[PDB]
Amino acid sequence: DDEETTALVCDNGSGLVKAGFAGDDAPRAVFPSIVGRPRHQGVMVGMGQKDSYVGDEAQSKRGILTLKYPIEHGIITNWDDMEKIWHHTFYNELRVAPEEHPTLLTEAPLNPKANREKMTQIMFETFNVPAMYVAIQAVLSLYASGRTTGIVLDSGDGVTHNVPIYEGYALPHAIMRLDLAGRDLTDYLMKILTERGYSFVTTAEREIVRDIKEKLCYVALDFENEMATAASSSSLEKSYELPDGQVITIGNERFRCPETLFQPSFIGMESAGIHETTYNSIMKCDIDIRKDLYANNVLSGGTTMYPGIADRMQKEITALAPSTMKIKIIAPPERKYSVWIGGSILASLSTFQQMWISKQEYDEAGPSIVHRKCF
Amino acid sequence: DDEETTALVCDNGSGLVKAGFAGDDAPRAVFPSIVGRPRHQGVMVGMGQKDSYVGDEAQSKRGILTLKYPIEHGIITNWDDMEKIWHHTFYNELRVAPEEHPTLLTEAPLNPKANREKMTQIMFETFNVPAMYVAIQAVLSLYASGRTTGIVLDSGDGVTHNVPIYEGYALPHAIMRLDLAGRDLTDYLMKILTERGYSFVTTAEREIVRDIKEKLCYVALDFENEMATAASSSSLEKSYELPDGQVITIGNERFRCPETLFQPSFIGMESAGIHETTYNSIMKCDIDIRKDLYANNVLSGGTTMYPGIADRMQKEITALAPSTMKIKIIAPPERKYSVWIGGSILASLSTFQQMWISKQEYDEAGPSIVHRKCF
Amino acid sequence: LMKILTERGYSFVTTAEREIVRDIKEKLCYVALDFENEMATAASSSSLEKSYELPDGQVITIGNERFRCPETLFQPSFIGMESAGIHETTYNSIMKCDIDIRKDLYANNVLSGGTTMYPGIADRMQKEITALAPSTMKIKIIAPPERKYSVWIGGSILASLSTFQQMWISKQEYDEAGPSIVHRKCF
Amino acid sequence: DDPIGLFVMRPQDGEVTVGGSITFSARVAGKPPVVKWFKGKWVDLSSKVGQHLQLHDSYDRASKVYLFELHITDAQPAFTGSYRCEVSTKDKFDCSNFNLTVHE
Amino acid sequence: EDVWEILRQAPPSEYERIAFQYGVTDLRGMLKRLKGMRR
Amino acid sequence: EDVWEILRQAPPSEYERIAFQYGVTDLRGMLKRLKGMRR
Amino acid sequence: EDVWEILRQAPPSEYERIAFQYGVTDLRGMLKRLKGMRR
């Protein structure tokens, strides 16, 4: 009931799937990437008691309904889950027919192709959108950065990569992921608080804890003197209302959760901090890109929204970088949407509709088409 | 408890350090050039849990113990590591006193001198061998070739050079390295398989992958028609037992790993394939050496043991060489040992003991002695 | 157990009532490897259908419970627990373990805990791992009968480990560092 | 009954009902041929092999027989349609399609 | 700034160069507002 | 077995390696009996 | 071959020329076996 169409700017933020339209300004879709299973079935008159309306209601059904990401590790283990996830989107919150609105498709690297293959065709059949398109979440924050040169540090919804760039020019060779997810930090948090006097395992228990991180948990630039600070610093020593109604007390954790992203010893991970992943990347970069980086040290990823994020970023680079060069990490507050924003852009980039995944193109070349000279 | 001595034919094969004696026939020493660090320290009664017995045991300790080459890039970043590496040798597998057995010393070009300076003195002090000597790994495969004329293509343990020669006569000007290491191929393999559906980063994970290459990964002469072959060729489409016990499936990689040595685009390297490094070298060679090369197109380097190695070698030279001339690349199966073999030879060359690095000579001239008129 | 037997015709809540019931488990309650065919078995299997003298003097009859008590350790649905069975806690652990530790596990699949003394304990242990493990690898869970004491035994050992008295918590050490001493570089 | 290629058993022409867990079976004396599940041409079925699209596949020495079988749980009209087991030895190939009509 | 006028008068696509020259990493945004205008 | 003689002649602490090599997860026990002897 | 006899009777060092003439790039090896003999 309008003009040609608006591309669908649908963005499965590694934790939440989100979305607006091309040229949109706010992803009108935002909500958990989980599926939920009650256990008991009190015989209950009548119905309306969905097994799997997780979408954005099921956390209302938290507890009895369990949790399921399909793309659990940024890895869609299952898809009908995610399928009806979409339908939920496009029919309750998108409440919109795919068939007539294009869409670009958010994706991080490292995917085996058939993931997209399948998602693609099924999105044409179940969806018959006018045409789709896919785009690396990473790249989609990249333009989303608009500093076409420099790396970006995508530690976002639950994701992590380094994205060296250079007026749009990025080196995949130097490009990397950090398996870390804010979910991961979640984990160690459960570890600590529970062992520290708490019994905190349950799905929405994880819900509360993630809330805890994203509201209060932080990091201090330093650690060891910042450890002594912790040794008696009462200010931190703050209890926060457990959403039961308890007031979950908090101290050194608030920060000792995230910081391990620089020291997976705490996660015990063999990996290395996100800073020196930046630095070894940059060293991989050409000789004097490095100053480009310095100006373009774009962080990305809201869960990383914590305090001092750059504070460290810079301090350690410093600790590693030649003071000769001047560093500057780059992280907008709005890093969640940034990826959505740049995707809006690109898809909304009217000089670019040639790229979208047409039903036909796929039809002649099936899904495999997607791969070469297209994604 | 015997006659004068046997020189020590000690050979840090770019990946493994190896060794026998002068006149020996098999390097009785062979094992990884890594150091290993556990993480956790489960409090564990008693001891015997070495930090750093890597040698040839620590891969038994793989996982918890990490990995460290000193000569990581054919570049000894550290030496006490390599120091006790030697001692391990000369005391567990050499289990032998340096002080009374000479030794020639394997080295690739491109080393800044002090590397050898230090190695030398310390090998006289810590080691007091009757006298040492050093010799370019490259040259040591060269005699090791015995075709004193012609280049050799040393892409070995993890190394890569072209070694134009000519009855012993080689032009360093025309001589070159290819940073490529079988480790490098390892890399791109991890890249691919992991992104292709795998999560393969860990040190011994790299162990398995290198095993994978050296057991199964190959190359097909051609690529593009050999690409179509890949497009459906089921025979390749073979899964190999992942040493967890998994059976890691394999297809186009087996070959799409190494071949990039001719196209670092895949490694993204600015460099050029190993064949045309041969060819531009040869063109640098005098007008009619080139046929010498053709007969003397000696490959070297076991990791290059793959299939078709020469197959391409010749085909592309062809593609470049005048059919006027008749080519013949030269690669024994036993290219690992070849370098050791020729070193055995030279050192074992009794008409040659004058060269060995005497304690005194170094004493009067310190290490700097080594350089002029000696190495 | 209290849940079931009581609702099943019994009024069994009292502290030492719990005493008797725990005795019941540790003397008679078991588990059968399988469940569903082992459920049909239960459907009429009279052999199980055995009453045991209630220590009042009653003889508390017993059937499917004997086993339907413990087995839920693999299915807290029965305890309703959100958790998962003890076997796949082993398995997800092992998968967390390095690539080829897993065979180490297989040989080292050491159970511990006497209350778990029941029958088939490993029987399942292995069967389900199997059901999950690659037959490539060969499994072996490890549980001595004497698992209660085992912990005591190894503690005897360590403490008795005379090459180790350096670790013990000295009055003084605590005195200078109070209790907090305990924590770092000691426990 | 129907003609046999390999298909000593043939994945049937399923006129199932909704919910009819139906086993399309090539129990065939069996290199043993690889099976190729197809609805559509660009379109695989393995990406859809799930609890409702399930397989038992195993050889016999006694009879030289191998079982491809496909139990279909929770039969749905969405999966009403054409399906294929294109099977090939190291030398041969076998192409003949079969039906899933999940009725109701 | 003049980035407004200079991008409106920028060469059609090289708003790239002009926006990202004058700090506008959101040439992305410059066009996306220009698109909310020209959608 | 010889584990007896080989542990008595095992390197002093690496009775660890020898006991646990010859199946003696009770090097624990090997020493604890050796300790009931040497307590 | 006669490379054996001709190298044994080759001029002392120019076993170089004779070995590498008769294909023996392992004059290296010719001497190394002669050395396992003369070590």
mmCIF file of C-alpha atoms in Angstrom, chain F residues 7-27:
data_model
loop_
_atom_site.group_PDB
_atom_site.id
_atom_site.type_symbol
_atom_site.label_atom_id
_atom_site.label_comp_id
_atom_site.label_asym_id
_atom_site.label_seq_id
_atom_site.Cartn_x
_atom_site.Cartn_y
_atom_site.Cartn_z
ATOM 1 C CA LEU F 7 59.775 -48.347 43.436
ATOM 2 C CA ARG F 8 62.168 -49.042 46.275
ATOM 3 C CA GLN F 9 64.793 -48.415 43.583
ATOM 4 C CA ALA F 10 62.615 -45.905 41.800
ATOM 5 C CA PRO F 11 63.907 -42.365 41.819
ATOM 6 C CA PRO F 12 62.940 -40.982 45.188
ATOM 7 C CA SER F 13 59.874 -38.937 44.264
ATOM 8 C CA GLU F 14 59.220 -40.279 40.808
ATOM 9 C CA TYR F 15 57.812 -43.343 42.494
ATOM 10 C CA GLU F 16 55.059 -41.212 41.037
ATOM 11 C CA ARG F 17 56.019 -42.205 37.530
ATOM 12 C CA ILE F 18 56.864 -45.803 38.357
ATOM 13 C CA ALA F 19 53.831 -46.628 40.506
ATOM 14 C CA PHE F 20 51.375 -44.920 38.206
ATOM 15 C CA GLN F 21 53.213 -46.475 35.254
ATOM 16 C CA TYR F 22 52.834 -50.004 36.597
ATOM 17 C CA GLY F 23 49.183 -49.367 37.389
ATOM 18 C CA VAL F 24 49.756 -48.273 40.985
ATOM 19 C CA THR F 25 47.346 -45.330 41.269
ATOM 20 C CA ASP F 26 48.014 -46.112 44.886
ATOM 21 C CA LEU F 27 51.469 -44.824 44.771
#
